[PDB]
Amino acid sequence: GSHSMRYFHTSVSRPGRGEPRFITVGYVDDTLFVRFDSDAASPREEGRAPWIEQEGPEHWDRETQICKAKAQTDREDLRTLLRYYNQSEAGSHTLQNMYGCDVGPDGRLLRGYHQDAYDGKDYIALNEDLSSWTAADTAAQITQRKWEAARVAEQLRAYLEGECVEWLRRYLENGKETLQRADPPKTHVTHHPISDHEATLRCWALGFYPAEITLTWQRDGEDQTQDTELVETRPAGDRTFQKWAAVVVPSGEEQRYTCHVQHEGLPKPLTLRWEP
């Protein structure tokens, strides 16, 4: 159905231990396809998916040059932020940036993104209009004024609506075998007596792609939103994901509970119960 491309970037200063470490990764949906690490033996944009390996040497030089120049601008920006926030030069700080686009099943632009964070907090973000900014505080407003004067939003809009969408379409076609295949979850319910008054019912989902999924428990057809323990969706390491949801049930009432599973790979939502 719908797809995304995203580039993530993190710079972490380490005063007294050299220059900041810079790591950037690119994803199409939940598939990593490129990485660059400034601490690597030979820092370069490295392919991580078979469908990107067909890109030529000119492509890799272009991406590598952009990563090296982004690592430099981030070092400069980390110094700038110390000034804007009146901070000491002694501490370690983090700069994060994420940009990219979402497209529908028809490959048309759904929305574009460009957002930055300092020390884990929102700093400045390009709004959905791709023409205005949301600054988190008076320091980000200084960057906003600079970015409005330089018409940065216009430059970003041209990339997000142009190259971002066209190259996302290109990668979806080149990688259609995997990027356009949904792997449905493999499901089961386990039962663990806790004592003689209560028991745990755990509903599992394994081997699915993409990561997006919904697992819920119902008791007599009513959602158990507050009483359900939901683990964060987690990577298996083979491209697929895993998730579980658990409920503590009064002994003898197990058949009153049903697990519900929604996933792109399923034509219809699944209903499971503890068997037997």
Binding site: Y7, T73, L81, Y84, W147, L156
Partner: peptide
């Protein structure tokens, strides 16, 4: 494909 544009804070 990355954005080639460079912007400073």
């Amino acid at each position: 494909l990355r954005n080639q544009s460079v912007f400073n804070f």
